[PDB]
Design a protein around this ligand. Structure first.
Ligand code: NAP
Ligand code: NAP
Ligand code: NAP
Ligand code: NAP
Lengths: 312, 308, 298, 335, 297
């Protein structure tokens, strides 16, 4: 019998997702790594329990997370049944379809076949009646967005997803998906782009404007550039990373914490989607919330060191 | 049973019209050879070979057998036995429109027949849904509004992922596209008879209507039920068409299929089989999909000369 | 589908040993012609004709097909389609003992094999229980106490109404009667190979063991697989002609000439063969002279 | 989809269990270690697939195997569903109740309450309608054997277990259990004692004679003394070993260097000889090995190539291999 | 989510029930009163939680406990589902049939009809596959004991009761029930008689000897004479021992290995806390046996 921390909602920051009434935790946990059948279930269990005890209420999955593909969703479903029986309604669970999942022409892409068949498999693996958020995981340029949109609408209409989202769509495609979903009277909830201090296509492309103009949330994935922004590649690269680490030290933050605080420095990002291989990493990362302020000078110096090391 | 791991290596897949659904260039139909009059072991060897060759689309109708219904039952049986892990790699269709059961609700295009028939097909196959449900033919006594709305209810209720029509004129096809658009459903596919010796589809303007509306085309009786495998002039022309195939290094069947697949106007050709070896032969059509301008003229000329 | 209303008018039924169960004098076996290699419509026409002739007993085993299990599955399908309203008018048997599935639990007489096999058979046929469950053969490496107790568990648990054995010697039969009596279950039936050209049953004393213990006898391969349909076979055919019978009919009548045999378990590949075979019942008498001449030729 | 090795039944030896018709593989796999939630499911899957591909058809479990308790049974149930859907009827699956499993007075021991509640939990964890063998896992001197026996009989009668067994019972208690089960017309199938070259209470006590006289099988547990009889601890304690994760207290001055020579002389590893030795007698039905990786199964099954020992060999072993003081289950067998 | 006290098994004493392997807590909770639909569910919840947190693992019910009849079993089923979902297998739950439950000739007594139909209703009310102990609740002199026994034996054989018991049977009828149940290879587990300082028919009749000789446990009911032995001259002896009167009355029953358990009631948690402290000092007619009709037959 497991009891979650009664103070779990006392310290975490929650942000409204775009114009919706759904509040996401400022840090969410992704299950891309460390939740496959290659990882011991006890290690996974400790991570999920610590995340919920820190008030992280959003867990982000996809069909092909593991390895092997599907295993994160299965393991998550097991831990849900064992430790989160009483807590499902306090969690926001997402899954996605778009990348290679199973063999053949219906195992990848953006067709109605793949999306709806995949959603069913994901709900069965996780033991859920519905996900909170179902995503088109990437752009499929060979499926008309009308078809992808109508699949997402069917997920909602049928009660298999409460809300829908997209991931790695250009601003123009995002705008088209908002419009197609509006024809079904469904608001696009959220957009999940890769976004970190060293990868700012989101800024440069004008995505954040499209999102804000349409009331769509933003959840940043690989916010630590998969560990590059943690301190653990040319000479100028390393020297810049060293200087960024020194800025983080000046702020009283690890490099990881400053990378997260930077994404969260303004309202433009709803949540950052962190990974963890152990509970202590969650404890460190959520402390990013203790220092979300950057001076104009700091923001310039950060961009400058990135310019100087050619980390763009 | 384990499907061939290399099954997706050689088959060609085509997007169905403007949709994201990729059909195999050759699909298997179950019109013949899958009734209760046919041994289940023979059926099993055919379906297993089809999937091993990368044929992912299996086309059924309520009344396929004989007797009526039995193709769907037998398929369902084999699906459970051998394809338990593979449903989501398959495109399965059924249809309603011809005589299936006695009386005024057993044929035609009414909401009663279509929906009651879809339910019977899902139960016989053991499926929650078909990938493609079709109106199997035109019913001039049911308003197309009723037929279209029945197809829409199928989609809405989760009993069919997509819908199609079979043997509709270009004008009726265009009206069905429009009626289904009112429901925000794109018509996926049209299934006409179409082969070297039967080109109403081209001449009527059907292929243009399909392409213009982003509807796929799957050719039924692509071998003219074996003719492409009778007066003197007919036979003599078929002999010459056979010789052109020989020149190409193809059987007549393979050339007949390649010809339909020579361009993007056809999504798929719907072949039958009574044994596994015929599937092996037919899919080799993909090795030679090119026809010169001269070849296409000579083919049409021999067809003209034999009055085929 | 409606069964012939006169189906009980002509068939002869015999009490199985001392029990109250009446079997038809001719029963249908599904050893051949009911596999996935045989079209279902042909199978359907055979079963409908058998029931229309009053044959109420259908004999199956786990490994009947081919492939193994397919007879039981095809039977289950036809039961559901055509015999939905008639299950309680039918006596259905199955068996375990021969090779069914790979490995050490897929053959023989163990509790593991018999009880697992029964479960698979009931699932393949779509039945809550069989009327008769059999040990299909002797397993000299499993103690009979184990085999018997498995059969008893089948009865106690409601998976089989009665139990039987097949191809057991008179001595092993007697032991199985005794082991089952310890459970207060009477052995219903013995199924031996028995025909004009294979009479170990007579020579061994089996029929006496069966009668003494009230156990029924159902003869399998009663036509020696079709052989009883060269110079001696010619003369046996001439005796059949003299009786106004086909050779097949005489072979069956011969087995049924005594109260010693409850039923003969025929196979059929088409309906017409059933129609011919049941007419054996029109001439069940043999003179002493005939019986001698038959033995003399054969 | 997964396909088992078609030749899986070509090399393994199967032995009739006592006087029953149940044939166990001469090597069985136990899930005491390496199948908990602390062990990756992929590693477990590779072990079970290799075991079945070698013809090992018997998997032995217990309620409290893991860690944590219950997790071996849950993981096994998952793998059964995923890889062995078509093969359940080719497997012999056991579980047990008798050690500490859950808190309180009903969570340990031999009572009808504990045994029947536990069997239900094991079936639910494994996703099975029944186990092939249900055991009383040890002696409980405070529960009358009549109660324990009757609980095992209810397991059989109700269809939750095909056969029943006992583990670590003295010859006298074994004999009583055979008698009490006979009153229910159930034959006791099997006895599971600790038995290896360095732990021979089974020989000394007369247990093998009791078992044969009652037609009861014998499945030898810790047949490698947990790894000690593998030689893996002759020149150091390896990183990837149970002892680094069974302690170095067991490596006393008191055998292994001598035994290793004898094994070399036979063309066997020490592990193989240890197994062959248990299997030299037709009264040992099987040896119940553990494995932390597939390669260990491949080595161990080759024990079956050399099951013969000369009088001299047996004499030297009896002379020169003293009790190892490693029977951690002696409490049960001394009652 | 509710978590039971992790030290719940640290203080309670457990006793083997007769010759069986089943260990009952020395104090068990009965639901005769205070668990009907006339009692707030929150109050009931606080009592059961405290009982378990003190290591009391046995809860004793009957079909007609309430009021109204059946309601204790229903309330208990609810609380089981809400707070004891993870703990069923740590609990010993009993029910009974024998007194008036429903109208008519099948609603009382010892017939196979009443006992088996009643067991099915009890299991449905409590949401349980089986009870740990099913009892014949009293003697029915108009049903042959062979019938009652066989009904108890069917409960066990069918998996609806793990063990069976009897309540308020004379020594002679107890002995007959032991013998009848042995013909089914079932040992009678337990006898539940009224027994307290002011009501000792159990001693005088020879029942404790019959029980011990047959390996049957004894669970004492109305051990506080319903509250009379709580205080609301004996009180002065209790004071001398450093005990409340209640504690001394319970200690007295538990002074011997003759009593497996004393079956207390409670209307609030604090009474459980007080009563279990009886275990700290186990060393040493009121005309109130309202269940004497049954024990006199
Ligand atoms: N939609 C998409 O296309 C997409 C693509 C990628 C990811 N994502 C999502 O985003 C999530 C985040 O991606 P990611 O795993 O690359 O996240 P990240 O936050 O970029 O890196 C996470 C990893 O960095 C390490 N780490 C985390 N906190 C740390 C700390 N305080 N100090 C040192 N190291 C630390 C851990 O790895 P070690 O255990 O190796 O130390 C952890 O597993 C995923 O789980 C997934 O759901 C989505
Ligand atoms: N317990 C055991 O060990 C065991 C072993 C074997 C059989 N059996 C049982 O015994 C049953 C009978 O075995 P069986 O099929 O060999 O029996 P059989 O009656 O000796 O031979 C039947 C076959 O003979 C042919 N036949 C039948 N009637 C005929 C007629 N009137 N005219 C011409 N040909 C005729 C048919 O074969 P064609 O028409 O194809 O030539 C038919 O399939 C089985 O179905 C089975 O249930 C049991
Ligand atoms: N009834 C009971 O009370 C009881 C008690 C104990 C056990 N058991 C049963 O008996 C089974 C076996 O117990 P056990 O695992 O201690 O038996 P074991 O066979 O004495 O020990 C097996 C361990 O030895 C190592 N090993 C095996 N083969 C090897 C080789 N060829 N080379 C090197 N190392 C090798 C492995 O450990 P590492 O690789 O991790 O070092 C493996 O996990 C249990 O799984 C359970 O089913 C029952
Ligand atoms: N088999 C049968 O025929 C039969 C018959 C009767 C009972 N029983 C069983 O035995 C159980 C016990 O019956 P019972 O409730 O009369 O038993 P009891 O132990 O004689 O009395 C319990 C009652 O005494 C009062 N009390 C308890 N502890 C106290 C304390 N420490 N200080 C002050 N007052 C205290 C409480 O009543 P207040 O707090 O409201 O005053 C409580 O409801 C029943 O629940 C039932 O399961 C069986």
């Amino acid at each position: 019998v497991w009891l979650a921390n009664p103070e779990r909602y006392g310290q975490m920051q929650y942000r409204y997702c775009g114009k919706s009434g759904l509040r996401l935790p400022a840090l969410s946990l992704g299950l891309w790594h460390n939740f496959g059948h290659v990882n011991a279930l006890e290690s996974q269990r400790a991570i999920l329990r610590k995340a919920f005890d820190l008030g992280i209420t959003h867990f982000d999955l996809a069909n092909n997370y593991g390895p092997p593909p599907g295993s994160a969703e299965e393991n998550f479903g097991r831990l849900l049944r064992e430790d989160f029986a009483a807590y499902r309604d306090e969690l926001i669970i997402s899954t996605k379809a778009g990348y290679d999942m199973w063999p053949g022409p219906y195992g990848s892409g953006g067709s109605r076949k793949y999306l709806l068949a995949s959603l069913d498999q994901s709900l069965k693996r996780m033991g859920l009646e519905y996900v909170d958020i179902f995503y088109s995981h990437r752009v499929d340029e060979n499926t008309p967005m009308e078809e992808t949109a109508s699949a997402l609408a069917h997920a909602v209409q049928s009660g298999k997803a409460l809300y829908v989202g997209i991931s790695s769509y250009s601003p123009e495609r995002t705008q088209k998906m908002v419009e197609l979903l509006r024809e079904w009277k469904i608001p696009l909830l959220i957009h999940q782009p890769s976004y970190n201090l060293l990868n700012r296509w989101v800024d440069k492309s004008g995505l954040l404007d499209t999102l804000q103009n349409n009331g769509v949330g933003c959840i940043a994935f690989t916010p630590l550039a998969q560990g590059l922004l943690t301190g653990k590649l040319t000479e100028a690269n390393l020297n810049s990373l060293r200087l960024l680490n020194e800025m983080a030290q000046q702020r009283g933050q690890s490099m990881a914490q400053m990378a997260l605080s930077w994404l969260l420095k303004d309202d433009r990002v709803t949540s950052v989607l962190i990974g963890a291989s152990r509970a202590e990493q969650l404890e460190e990362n959520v402390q990013a919330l203790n220092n979300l302020t950057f001076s104009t000078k700091e923001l310039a110096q950060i961009d400058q060191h990135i310019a100087d090391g050619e980390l763009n």
